[PDB]
Design a binder for this molecule. Structure first.
Ligand SMILES: CC(C)[C@H](Nc1ncnc2c1CCN2)c1ccc2c(c1)[S@@](=O)CCO2
Length: 168
């Protein structure tokens, strides 16, 4: 459980690796994996589609049942559901989609959800098609999360850019 290996240490609680979060979850068996979710928990692509496919759609069926009873999440919010075969729990976190006009200041609320868990495997929030500047997302993570977070970024070019920028 929680056997993280091959990460670069950015701060005493923030680590980063060039890796697919699904492959890390299979290797590590973390207590918590974070999903880069949307408010209706529709796992149609990106991190969410990869995690759901690796559960053979069990995550989508569970998420639809959660939304039917509880309604959608808010941007900046989260919920804890099963991790299925990938982790004990999946923390579904909604970062702002600035390509759809959502407020970038909600990225701090999004990362604050990680503080409820002592250790997590997570993606870089609001990056990719959500449109936030990834260097800014990493700075928000480092300034907001106080628990131990292991970031898997599935792109070597982005990984090297983020490390270079943080070592300036
Ligand atoms: C930046 C990009 C490379 C990253 N993708 C991944 N990171 C880690 N493991 C992964 C991926 C894809 C498959 N497996 C990512 C980060 C947040 C993010 C997205 C995508 S999009 O899903 C939607 C909005 O949030």
């Amino acid at each position: 459980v929680n056997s993280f290996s091959g990460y670069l240490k950015l701060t005493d609680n923030v680590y980063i690796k060039n890796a697919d979060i699904v492959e890390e979850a299979k290797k590590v068996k973390p207590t918590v994996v974070v999903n880069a979710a949307n408010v209706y928990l529709k796992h149609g692509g990106g991190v969410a589609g990869a995690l759901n496919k690796a559960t053979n759609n069990a995550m989508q069926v569970e998420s639809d049942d959660y939304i039917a009873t509880n309604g959608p999440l808010k941007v900046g919010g989260s919920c804890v559901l099963s991790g299925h075969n990938l982790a004990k729990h999946c923390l579904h976190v909604v970062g702002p989609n600035v390509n759809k006009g959502e407020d970038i200041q909600l990225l701090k609320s999004a990362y604050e959800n990680f503080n409820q868990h002592e250790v997590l495997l997570a993606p870089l929030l609001s990056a990719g098609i959500f449109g936030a500047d990834p260097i800014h997302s990493l700075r928000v993570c480092v300034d907001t999360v106080r628990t131990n977070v292991y970031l898997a970024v599935f792109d070597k070019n982005l990984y090297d850019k983020l490390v270079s920028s943080f070592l300036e």
